[PDB]
Amino acid sequence: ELRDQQEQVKEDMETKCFICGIGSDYFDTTPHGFETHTLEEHNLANYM
Amino acid sequence: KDMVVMLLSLLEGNVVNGMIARQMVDMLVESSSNVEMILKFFDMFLKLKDIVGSEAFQDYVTDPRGLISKKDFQKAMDSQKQFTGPEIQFLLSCSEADENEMINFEEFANRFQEPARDIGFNVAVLLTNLSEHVPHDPRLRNFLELAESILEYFRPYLGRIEIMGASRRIERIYFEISETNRAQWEMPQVKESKRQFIFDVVNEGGEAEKMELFVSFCEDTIFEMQIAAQISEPFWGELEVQRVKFLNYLSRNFYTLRFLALFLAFAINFILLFYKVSDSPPNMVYYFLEESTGYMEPALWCLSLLHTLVAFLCIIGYNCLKVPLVIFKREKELARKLEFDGLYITEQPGDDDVKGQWDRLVLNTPSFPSNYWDKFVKRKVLDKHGDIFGRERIAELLGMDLASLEITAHNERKPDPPPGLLTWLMSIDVKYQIWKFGVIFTDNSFLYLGWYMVMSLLGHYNNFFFAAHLLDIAMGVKTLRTILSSVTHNGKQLVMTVGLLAVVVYLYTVVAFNFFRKFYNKSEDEDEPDMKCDDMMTCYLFHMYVGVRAGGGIGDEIEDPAGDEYELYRVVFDITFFFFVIVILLAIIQGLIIDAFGELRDQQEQVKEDMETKCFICGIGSDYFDTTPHGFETHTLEEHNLANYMFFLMYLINKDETEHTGQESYVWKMYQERCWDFFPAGDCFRKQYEDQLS
Amino acid sequence: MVMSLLGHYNNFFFAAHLLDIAMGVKTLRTILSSVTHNGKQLVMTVGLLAVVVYLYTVVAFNFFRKFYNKSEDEDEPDMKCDDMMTCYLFHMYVGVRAGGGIGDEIEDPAGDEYELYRVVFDITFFFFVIVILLAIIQGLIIDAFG
Amino acid sequence: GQWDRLVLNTPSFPSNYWDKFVKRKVLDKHGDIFGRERIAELLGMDLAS
Ligand SMILES: CCCCCCCC/C=C/CCCCCCCC(=O)O[C@@H](COC(=O)CCCCCCCCCCCCCCCCC)COP(=O)([O-])OCC[N+](C)(C)C
Ligand SMILES: CCCCCCCC/C=C/CCCCCCCC(=O)O[C@@H](COC(=O)CCCCCCCCCCCCCCCCC)COP(=O)([O-])OCC[N+](C)(C)C
Ligand SMILES: CCCCCCCC/C=C/CCCCCCCC(=O)O[C@@H](COC(=O)CCCCCCCCCCCCCCCCC)COP(=O)([O-])OCC[N+](C)(C)C
Ligand SMILES: CCCCCCCC/C=C/CCCCCCCC(=O)O[C@@H](COC(=O)CCCCCCCCCCCCCCCCC)COP(=O)([O-])OCC[N+](C)(C)C
Ligand SMILES: Nc1ncnc2c1ncn2[C@@H]1O[C@H](COP(=O)(O)OP(=O)(O)OP(=O)(O)O)[C@@H](O)[C@H]1O
Ligand SMILES: Nc1ncnc2c1ncn2[C@@H]1O[C@H](COP(=O)(O)OP(=O)(O)OP(=O)(O)O)[C@@H](O)[C@H]1O
Ligand SMILES: Cn1c(=O)c2c(ncn2C)n(C)c1=O
Ligand SMILES: [Ca+2]
Ligand SMILES: [Zn+2]
Ligand SMILES: [Zn+2]
Numbered sequence: 009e010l011r012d013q014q015e016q017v018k019e020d021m022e023t024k025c026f027i028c029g030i031g032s033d034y035f036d037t038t039p040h041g042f043e044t045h046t047l048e049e050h051n052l053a054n055y056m
Numbered sequence: 057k058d059m060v061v062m063l064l065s066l067l068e069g070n071v072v073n074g075m076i077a078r079q080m081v082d083m084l085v086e087s088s089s090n091v092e093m094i095l096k097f098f099d100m101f102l103k104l105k106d107i108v109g110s111e112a113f114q115d116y117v118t119d120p121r122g123l124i125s126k127k128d129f130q131k132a133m134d135s136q137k138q139f140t141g142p143e144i145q146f147l148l149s150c151s152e153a154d155e156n157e158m159i160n161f162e163e164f165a166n167r168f169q170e171p172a173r174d175i176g177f178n179v180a181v182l183l184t185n186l187s188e189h190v191p192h193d194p195r196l197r198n199f200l201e202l203a204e205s206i207l208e209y210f211r212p213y214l215g216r217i218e219i220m221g222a223s224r225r226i227e228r229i230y231f232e233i234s235e236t237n238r239a240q241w242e243m244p245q246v247k248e249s250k251r252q253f254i255f256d257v258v259n260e261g262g263e264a265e266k267m268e269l270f271v272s273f274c275e276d277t278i279f280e281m282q283i284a285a286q287i288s289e290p291f292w293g294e295l296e297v298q299r300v301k302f303l304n305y306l307s308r309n310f311y312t313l314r315f316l317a318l319f320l321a322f323a324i325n326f327i328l329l330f331y332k333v334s335d336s337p338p339n340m341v342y343y344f345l346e347e348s349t350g351y352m353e354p355a356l357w358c359l360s361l362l363h364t365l366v367a368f369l370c371i372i373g374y375n376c377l378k379v380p381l382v383i384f385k386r387e388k389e390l391a392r393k394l395e396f397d398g399l400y401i402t403e404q405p406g407d408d409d410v411k412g413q414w415d416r417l418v419l420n421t422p423s424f425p426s427n428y429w430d431k432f433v434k435r436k437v438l439d440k441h442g443d444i445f446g447r448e449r450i451a452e453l454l455g456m457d458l459a460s461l462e463i464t465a466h467n468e469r470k471p472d473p474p475p476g477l478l479t480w481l482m483s484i485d486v487k488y489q490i491w492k493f494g495v496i497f498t499d500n501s502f503l504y505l506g507w508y509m510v511m512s513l514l515g516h517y518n519n520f521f522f523a524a525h526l527l528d529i530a531m532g533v534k535t536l537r538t539i540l541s542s543v544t545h546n547g548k549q550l551v552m553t554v555g556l557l558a559v560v561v562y563l564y565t566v567v568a569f570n571f572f573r574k575f576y577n578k579s580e581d582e583d584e585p586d587m588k589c590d591d592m593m594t595c596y597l598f599h600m601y602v603g604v605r606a607g608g609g610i611g612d613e614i615e616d617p618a619g620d621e622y623e624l625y626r627v628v629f630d631i632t633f634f635f636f637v638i639v640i641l642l643a644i645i646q647g648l649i650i651d652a653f654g655e656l657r658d659q660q661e662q663v664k665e666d667m668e669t670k671c672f673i674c675g676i677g678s679d680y681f682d683t684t685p686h687g688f689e690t691h692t693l694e695e696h697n698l699a700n701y702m703f704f705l706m707y708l709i710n711k712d713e714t715e716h717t718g719q720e721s722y723v724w725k726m727y728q729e730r731c732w733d734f735f736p737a738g739d740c741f742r743k744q745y746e747d748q749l750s
Numbered sequence: 751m752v753m754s755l756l757g758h759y760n761n762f763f764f765a766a767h768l769l770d771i772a773m774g775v776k777t778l779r780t781i782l783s784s785v786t787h788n789g790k791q792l793v794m795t796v797g798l799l800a801v802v803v804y805l806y807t808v809v810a811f812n813f814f815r816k817f818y819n820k821s822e823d824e825d826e827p828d829m830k831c832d833d834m835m836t837c838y839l840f841h842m843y844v845g846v847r848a849g850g851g852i853g854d855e856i857e858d859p860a861g862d863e864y865e866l867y868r869v870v871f872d873i874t875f876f877f878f879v880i881v882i883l884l885a886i887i888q889g890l891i892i893d894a895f896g
Numbered sequence: 897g898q899w900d901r902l903v904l905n906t907p908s909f910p911s912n913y914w915d916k917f918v919k920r921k922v923l924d925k926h927g928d929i930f931g932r933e934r935i936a937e938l939l940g941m942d943l944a945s
Contacts, residue, residue: 039737112931137928331834523808535794605850605876646885653893
């Protein structure tokens with residue numbers, strides 16, 4: 009039970025945006041789209 | 057072929073239903089009779105090649121010399137029901153029948169196979185390119201049907217990949233896969249490396265590094281193919297040719313020697329089961345074999361020497377087969393950090409990276425890129441960091457002679473390479489060898505082989521040391537290694553819970569020493585008591601030795617607590633030690649092992665699921681491709697096959713740069729610049745032309 | 751059928767037929783499938799168990815033989831580790847089946863020069879064989895159910 | 897595969913399989929490239945019949 013909680017948290021962060029909630033599949037239409045979205049567009053650190 | 061290459065150049069950057077592509081189809085239709093005649097030339101001799109090798113044809117061949125008469129040839133061909141009347145007559149005219157009408161069908165079949173191969177492949181590429189870009193032209197299927205044999209023959213060699221071209225669109229590239237490249241790719245060792253690589257990137261890899269890791273895998277695979285080719289098999293000169301043959305034999309049979317050493321270890325240990333210790337010679341005792349055959353004692357000596365020899369050959373087999381890859385990989389990563397990062401120019405690792413600090417010895421060595429293919433890395437680094445860091449300082453760091461750069465570019469010198477051993481002594485780069493040996497001595501696989509050899513030598517001092525070799529079954533059999541991985545997966549947790557077990561037992565010891573000492577008399581004697589808890593160190597050892605191993609905990613070992621003032625306190629001590637140590641803490645140790653089995657199992661399932669649900673190259677799911685029947689299967693075998701990208705890289709390296717096409721030059725330039733934007737990511741040819749294709 | 755005919759020679763052979771419940775009842779077959787699913791792994795870990803016990807036997811024959819006297823008699827000793835084959839059988843027979851490992855069966859290591867060495871031998875054999883290797887056998891069966 | 901060679905030339909090879917003309921179909925498909933008489937010998941077929 010504890011192991012899957014770590015896996016679930018890791019999976020959610022790498023499959024959905026923490027801010028908008030849109031999945032990585034939509035952003036991956038553009039090469040490295042999800043990586044750029046989570047580092048430039050909806051980076052949670054920038055909101056801080 | 058040159059005309060077809062020109063036609064293929066007109067199709068560069070051609071969209072589906074493009075005007076150039078449709079014009080080319082009209083040109084083929086306008087000359088359909090000539091195109092059919094050309095296609096009928098290729099298939100007739102391709103069919104003739106397989107007919108002469110057929111069993112039915114050999115039944116007609118009666119001449120012992122291996123010839124066949126024209127009349128016999130005439131009745132042989134029409135019995136195959138593959139050629140028509142005029143076609144057989146044309147084949148008879150092409151056959152160089154002598155004055156006796158005898159035909160050498162062996163040379164006849166092979167006469168045009170080689171000269172017409174290059175043009176035949178390009179025609180197949182041209183028809184394939186037109187078919188996939190003009191898929192709704194009824195006039196083009198006729199040519200495809202007439203060229204079915206040509207397309208079938210060149211199917212294993214017609215490699216196709218999809219790239220993101222400079223025009224910001226997905227383009228499909230057709231190239232040639234040589235027989236040797238495909239044969240080397242299908243070797244079991246290469247296939248095993250591919251499976252290991254696929255598992256690593258899918259399990260513990262990221263999407264941003266996926267393509268860079270894939271290219272690094274391609275570079276390593278190409279290097280391994282060269283090693284396999286070198287070791288393959290079809291007074292200084294006399295010994296050198298035998299020395300390389302002996303080394304290649306060890307390299308080819310490295311795994312058989314590893315199996316042989318394991319087999320010899322069991323044979324030695326089987327004999328060791330007959331050892332017997334006796335005071336009488338065969339107050340010190342004597343260890344001797346106890347057997348009636350009388351052959352086991354000489355056999356043990358022979359096997360011990362043979363096992364030592366095999367273990368020594370494994371080290372030689374390893375350093376000639378696996379070490380070159382280790383050096384190649386380390387030189388590869390070091391060269392890129394020198395150029396694309398300036399590891400020893402700008403950052404200067406902070407002494408906490410032993411790998412980085414050890415590589416400083418090879419920077420100025422004259423033979424630094426010994427295994428890495430790029431022999432001009434120093435030249436490239438000088439041009440990139442010379443202006444900002446100092447050309448003379450860069451040359452000193454890399455051991456480069458600036459005055460020698462021009463003279464090499466001016467002309468070439470041909471010195472005398474005297475084949476003497478004395479001249480070979482000072483030609484050895486001692487500093488490079490020291491660096492190389494340090495890398496080998498830090499390799500886990502080499503150190504294991506070295507331990508196996510040391511233990512084999514110790515076996516000569518006492519034969520019982522040959523027992524250690526039976527551990528090799530840990531990596532000798534992959535089934536045991538997977539089982540043992542279920543123990544080492546949570547090894548750190550297993551160590552900590554044992555340490556936690558020691559602490560909880562110490563707390564029980566402190567309580568016992570302070571309050572329950574009277575109950576620790578382990579002597580049935582009445583006048584000399586063996587008190588086990590009169591010292592903390594003794595009492596702690598007692599709890600750790602007999603307390604943990606006891607089924608019911610410490611209570612089983614210590615005296616009964618009945619009719620005593622502290623009976624209730626002692627029942628809590630005994631029940632709590634049973635629960636916390638015997639029940640809970642041992643369940644944690646077993647729980648970690650059981651959880652590891654599940655964790656390792658799902659990793660295999662996750663890797664298998666990802667490969668069968670997403671494309672390794674573009675990442676698009678199988679659901680999208682399955683709109684078209686068997687769409688994902690065709691996409692992963694024809695459109696975005698990862699093996700074709702391996703072949704395309706090998707195709708570019710072998711092909712001359714002046715002969716590169718526009719698409720090939722675009723990919724080749726980005727390979728040298730380490731830019732992986734040509735790999736399709738999230739897009740494919742089918743998706744780009746959904747409206748046109750459907 | 752062959753076992754039924756052998757049953758006529760000795761009726762006790764009719765016992766073998768009671769095994770049929772393995773496939774006679776589908777519930778048992780599913781349960782037994784949880785054992786045969788990782789059967790190859792179960793065979794290998796038993797083979798690994800035999801190898802680890804052999805290594806313990808080699809150490810015992812070489813250094814700890816005095817502690818393997820399994821005779822309460824005083825003039826005729828029943829030394830269990832005077833031969834490698836006998837000592838290996840002793841470890842595989844009573845050592846594996848013992849709850850606390852080999853230490854329970856062999857003589858106490860107290861007041862001896864090799865006491866600390868013998869405590870490491872006894873605790874490591876308890877951990878590696880009784881605890882870890884038996885957990886693997888049970889872990890394989892549990893994982894098969896999942 | 898090696899055990900099935902005994903049934904190739906048997907007169908009643910497709911006893912349970914519904915296709916009773918498998919030998920006829922195989923002869924028409926591989927007879928030209930492998931030899932009609934050799935295929936008939938392999939499958940135990942009488943060409944004159
Ligand atoms: C120590 C084992 C190292 C690996 C452990 C894993 C194996 C598990 C158990 C294996 C069983 C070992 C056999 C023990 C019985 C040997 C009894 C014996 O001969 O005991 C020896 C002790 O001598 C020694 O200790 C020599 C060995 C040198 C140091 C031993 C340590 C091994 C070094 C390991 C090398 C690298 C290790 C690093 C990696 C860590 C492990 C991966 C005495 O003789 P003997 O005089 O009367 O006769 C000789 C006959 N004449 C004297 C007449 C000629
Ligand atoms: C009195 C009841 C307190 C017991 C509560 C137990 C709760 C947990 C406490 C554990 C330590 C107990 C120490 C009590 C402090 C002193 C008590 C006292 O007044 O001491 C009482 C005696 O009462 C007792 O006998 C208490 C017996 C305690 C037995 C409890 C068994 C539980 C064992 C738990 C082991 C801990 C490991 C936990 C690991 C966690 C893993 C999950 C009178 O002295 P004293 O004039 O004869 O001179 C002290 C003796 N010296 C001269 C040596 C100093
Ligand atoms: C051996 C069992 C094979 C299957 C094992 C699985 C079953 C597990 C255990 C079953 C219990 C078996 C009963 C043992 C008690 C029998 C005592 C006895 O009668 O012992 C017999 C021994 O004789 C035999 O051994 C005969 C049997 C022939 C060989 C036995 C091997 C069985 C062959 C198996 C066939 C295929 C096996 C291959 C598949 C592998 C297994 C799936 C002696 O008599 P008895 O003279 O004094 O009297 C007879 C009375 N009068 C003599 C006066 C008439
Ligand atoms: C000296 C300390 C070394 C002990 C380190 C133990 C680490 C692992 C080693 C295991 C084998 C130990 C052999 C030591 C080599 C010789 C030592 C020596 O110098 O030998 C010392 C004696 O010291 C000792 O007593 C060492 C006792 C070792 C006990 C260690 C218990 C650990 C058991 C581990 C079992 C391995 C199974 C692992 C399975 C893995 C599963 C995960 C003096 O000789 P010797 O003049 O009387 O003549 C040798 C006797 N013969 C005449 C017969 C040759
Ligand atoms: N809005 C978001 N902002 C940041 N990260 C996001 C967001 N949505 C999803 N993520 C994911 O969160 C993951 C965690 O971020 P990342 O690992 O890059 O952080 P870091 O600051 O480098 O350090 P650390 O590894 O400790 O988290 C990223 O890989 C990213 O895919
Ligand atoms: N780009 C890709 N290239 C190749 N295979 C891919 C790709 N994307 C996904 N796959 C999947 O990878 C799986 C593994 O390939 P496959 O099993 O056919 O390889 P193989 O060479 O026949 O041998 P092996 O069974 O050892 O892998 C395929 O079934 C396929 O669905
Ligand atoms: C010459 N050469 C290259 O140029 C090359 C390569 N891998 C990538 N490149 C770019 N290999 C293996 C290679 O031999
Ligand atoms: Ca050109
Ligand atoms: Zn977002
Ligand atoms: Zn793809």
